[PDB]
RNA sequence: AUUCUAUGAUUAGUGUGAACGAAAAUAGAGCAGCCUAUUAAAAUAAGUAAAAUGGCUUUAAAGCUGUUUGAAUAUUGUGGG
RNA sequence: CAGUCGCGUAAGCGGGGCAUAGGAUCACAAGAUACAAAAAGGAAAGAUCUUGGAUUUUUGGAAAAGCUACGCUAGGGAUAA
């Protein structure tokens, strides 16, 4: 004696259903999900919208599948023609908007600061063109260093800031969520981002290769001056 | 999010829409239907592009300048409550939860 | 005996942990998980 | 003149309260060193990682 | 007790022991108001 | 001060459970204080308080106890809770 | 829905596995919570949240071998002479 699984149809055709209601429990897709329907992990079909269950076949979608849908109007018939405009319901209620306004207080009912902030302290014409190329690169290299120095000042101030906030029991401590946002704003995990750029690496690889080859030129030329004196 | 569809439709050769009949079509039309509009002027869609737009911080101020009404209106998702009628609770503990079984409240109250 | 239950301790020193199973004849576990105390994804490492 | 709340006495405090300032700092010191620990973990790799708590 | 003394020591509750406090003083007998600044 | 009755209380609490189960306080019955005790007693208490261990009682305290050990001398803060 | 991460041009998808075969409480242990703290300041022992060790395999969860032709009592006669 096992516990019965009770598989099969839980809603017959034209039966009213609201979102989440199970329509068909199955082992595998005996009936595929169709219009306004969801399939769960175990292939159970649920209504996604309020409406009436409809069992149909869509030869345009799949030649040999049978689907279950949900129509907002009991008199509608599926499958809807592919060229007809989608039938959808708003599903929203109108309410007056909020009158929220920035009214952050400074002191609690006991006269104590809500937050106390502490900061820390610690080749004729080509040469002309190449010069324009070098200047542009040198200009950006100066700008990059003129702005990377700026980022190192905002990070230092942020990571060094300490906003102590009033908590229960008249205690003053830093909240854990603010401690998390010290390293950086949410949205990405600091450290996973690649600090370097692939294009910059290629540029460095060439420069190192040039000095190496050019290094042999100077050493080879230097050796020639020593040989001239010998001869 | 709202979908704003930018449609480009070609007019047939030698077919110039009257400058006054085009500004009359939108009169007293609050559900602009591209299908019907296209069929009346015998146009044909050739190009199209898309870009959406949702509520953002700058939405409220943009409505003020142009006087677009509807700023102080927020939409909340419609909630569907269960359609099952209320039923009396069942179980040994659920029955013996009234002052009658005050001597058995050590088995019925404060259950994890 | 073949499988052990390890504890992945947060490296934010917040005291939150995740428990996953792994075979003994394998390497220690190390994952990037969400620490609900600081509400940020940090590095979790096996206890021992 | 009772212990703690008497004249000329100081409340000792519960231990969670005494080790509060030293507890929030351990979390702050660790988060600041979080970006540098993930960079060393993604560079070295999950298999070659040898540093684990004790 | 500590809790009982602290409840009537703050002006938020209008405690009758609030006159024993200074404007910068806190009601709690253990915690203190940290100072804001860079030093 | 003690004793008797009820409430406090199918409570605090204990116990895997089943069950077991206080005290403060309140009300009533009685009321009485003393060592010069209204019938003849203390020069204010040392193998004692207490500790380890084995049991009892019990909520882990207090209380009772066999074995082995073993203190201090008054609010000018000694000793018990 | 809030929080914040991955993948994707985008739409979007993701709260393990194509579906159907792995038991609580108590006790105990490791983290967090800051609730209460038996005169008071602490603490112990409790409380909430997360998690772990179970042929708890009689798997809604006892630490458990037989004989009686000398048998006893209360019953049924599920047919047992
Ligand atoms: K009880
Ligand atoms: K004792
Ligand atoms: Mg009584
Ligand atoms: Mg004496
Ligand atoms: Mg004794
Ligand atoms: Mg004692
Ligand atoms: Mg004693
Ligand atoms: Mg106490
Ligand atoms: Mg006490
Ligand atoms: Mg059973
Ligand atoms: Mg069952
Ligand atoms: Mg029969």
Swiss-Prot record, chain A:
GO terms for molecular function: structural constituent of ribosome. It is found in: Mitochondrion. GO terms for cellular component: mitochondrial large ribosomal subunit. Keywords: Mitochondrion, Ribonucleoprotein, Ribosomal protein. One of its GO terms (biological process) is translation. Belongs to the bacterial ribosomal protein bL27 family. Component of the mitochondrial ribosome (mitoribosome), a dedicated translation machinery responsible for the synthesis of mitochondrial genome-encoded proteins, including at least some of the essential transmembrane subunits of the mitochondrial respiratory chain. The mitoribosomes are attached to the mitochondrial inner membrane and translation products are cotranslationally integrated into the membrane. Component of the mitochondrial large ribosomal subunit (mt-LSU). Mature N.crassa 74S mitochondrial ribosomes consist of a small (37S) and a large (54S) subunit. The 37S small subunit contains a 16S ribosomal RNA (16S mt-rRNA) and 32 different proteins. The 54S large subunit contains a 23S rRNA (23S mt-rRNA) and 42 different proteins. This is Large ribosomal subunit protein bL27m.
Curated annotation (Swiss-Prot), chain C:
One of its GO terms (biological process) is translation. Keywords: Mitochondrion, Ribonucleoprotein, Ribosomal protein. Signal peptide: none annotated. It is found in: Mitochondrion. GO terms for cellular component: mitochondrion; ribonucleoprotein complex; ribosome. GO terms for molecular function: structural constituent of ribosome. Its main location: mitochondrion. Belongs to the bacterial ribosomal protein bL33 family. Component of the mitochondrial ribosome (mitoribosome), a dedicated translation machinery responsible for the synthesis of mitochondrial genome-encoded proteins, including at least some of the essential transmembrane subunits of the mitochondrial respiratory chain. The mitoribosomes are attached to the mitochondrial inner membrane and translation products are cotranslationally integrated into the membrane. Component of the mitochondrial large ribosomal subunit (mt-LSU). Mature N.crassa 74S mitochondrial ribosomes consist of a small (37S) and a large (54S) subunit. The 37S small subunit contains a 16S ribosomal RNA (16S mt-rRNA) and 32 different proteins. The 54S large subunit contains a 23S rRNA (23S mt-rRNA) and 42 different proteins. bL33m stabilizes the tRNA acceptor stem in the E-site. This is Large ribosomal subunit protein bL33m.
From Swiss-Prot, chain D:
Component of the mitochondrial ribosome (mitoribosome), a dedicated translation machinery responsible for the synthesis of mitochondrial genome-encoded proteins, including at least some of the essential transmembrane subunits of the mitochondrial respiratory chain. The mitoribosomes are attached to the mitochondrial inner membrane and translation products are cotranslationally integrated into the membrane. Coiled coil: none annotated. Component of the mitochondrial large ribosomal subunit (mt-LSU). Mature N.crassa 74S mitochondrial ribosomes consist of a small (37S) and a large (54S) subunit. The 37S small subunit contains a 16S ribosomal RNA (16S mt-rRNA) and 32 different proteins. The 54S large subunit contains a 23S rRNA (23S mt-rRNA) and 42 different proteins. Belongs to the mitochondrion-specific ribosomal protein mL59 family. The chain holds residues 110 to 163 of 163 of the full protein. The gene is mrpl25. This is Large ribosomal subunit protein mL59. It is found in: Mitochondrion.
UniProtKB/Swiss-Prot annotation, chain E:
It is found in: Mitochondrion. Signal peptide: none annotated. Belongs to the universal ribosomal protein uL15 family. Component of the mitochondrial large ribosomal subunit (mt-LSU). Mature N.crassa 74S mitochondrial ribosomes consist of a small (37S) and a large (54S) subunit. The 37S small subunit contains a 16S ribosomal RNA (16S mt-rRNA) and 32 different proteins. The 54S large subunit contains a 23S rRNA (23S mt-rRNA) and 42 different proteins. Component of the mitochondrial ribosome (mitoribosome), a dedicated translation machinery responsible for the synthesis of mitochondrial genome-encoded proteins, including at least some of the essential transmembrane subunits of the mitochondrial respiratory chain. The mitoribosomes are attached to the mitochondrial inner membrane and translation products are cotranslationally integrated into the membrane. This is Large ribosomal subunit protein uL15m. It comes from Neurospora crassa (strain ATCC 24698 / 74-OR23-1A / CBS 708.71 / DSM 1257 / FGSC 987). The chain holds residues 251 to 289 of 312 of the full protein.
């Amino acid at each position: 004696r096992t516990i019965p699984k009770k598989l099969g149809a839980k809603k017959t055709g034209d039966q009213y259903v609201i979102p989440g209601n199970i329509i068909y429990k199955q082992r595998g897709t005996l009936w595929h999900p169709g219009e306004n329907t969801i399939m769960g992990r175990d292939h159970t079909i649920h209504a996604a919208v309020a409406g009436y269950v409809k069992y149909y076949r869509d030869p345009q979608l799949h030649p040999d599948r049978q689907y279950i849908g949900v129509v907002f109007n009991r008199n509608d018939k599926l499958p809807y023609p592919k060229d007809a405009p989608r039938k959808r319901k708003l599903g929203l209620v109108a309410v007056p908007r909020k009158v929220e306004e920035v009214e952050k207080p400074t002191m609690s009912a006991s006269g104590l600061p809500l937050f106390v902030t502490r900061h820390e302290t610690i080749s004729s014409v080509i040469a002309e063109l190449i010069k324009e190329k070098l200047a542009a690169r040198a200009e950006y290299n100066a700008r990059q260093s003129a702005l990377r120095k700026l980022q190192q000042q905002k990070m230092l101030a942020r990571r060094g800031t300490r906003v102590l906030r009033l908590m229960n029991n008249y205690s003053y401590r830093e909240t854990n969520w603010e401690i998390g946002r010290l390293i950086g704003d949410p949205g990405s995990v600091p450290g996973t981002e690649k600090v370097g750029s692939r294009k910059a690496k290629f540029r460095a690889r060439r420069r190192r290769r040039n000095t190496f080859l050019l290094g042999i030129k100077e050493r080879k030329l230097a050796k020639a001056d020593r040989r001239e004196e010998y001869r | 999010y709202h979908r704003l569809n930018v449609f480009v439709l070609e007019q047939k050769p030698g077919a110039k829409i009257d400058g006054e009949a085009l500004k009359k079509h939108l009169e007293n039309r609050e559900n602009f239907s591209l299908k019907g509009f296209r069929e009346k002027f015998d146009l044909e869609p050739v190009g199209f592009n898309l870009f959406r737009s949702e509520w953002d911080e700058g939405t409220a101020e943009v409505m003020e300048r142009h006087g677009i009404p509807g700023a102080e209106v927020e939409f909340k998702r419609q909630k569907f409550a269960s359609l099952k009628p209320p039923r009396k609770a069942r179980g040994w503990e659920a029955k013996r939860q009234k002052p009658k079984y005050k001597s058995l409240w050590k088995y019925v109250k404060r259950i994890a | 005996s073949r499988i052990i239950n390890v504890r992945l301790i947060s490296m934010a020193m917040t005291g939150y942990f995740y428990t996953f199973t792994r075979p003994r004849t394998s390497l220690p576990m190390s994952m990037l998980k969400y620490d609900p105390i600081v509400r940020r994804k940090v590095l979790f490492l096996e206890q021992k | 003149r009772v212990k703690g709340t008497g004249v000329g006495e100081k409340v000792k405090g519960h231990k969670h309260e005494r080790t509060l300032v030293a507890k929030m700092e351990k979390r702050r010191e660790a988060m600041l060193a979080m970006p540098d620990l993930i960079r060393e973990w993604k560079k070295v790799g999950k298999r070659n990682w040898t540093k684990f708590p004790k | 007790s500590r809790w009982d003394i602290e409840y009537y020591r703050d002006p938020a509750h209008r405690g009758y022991l609030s006159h024993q406090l200074a404007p910068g003083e806190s009601p709690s007998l253990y915690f203190k108001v940290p100072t804001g600044g860079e030093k």
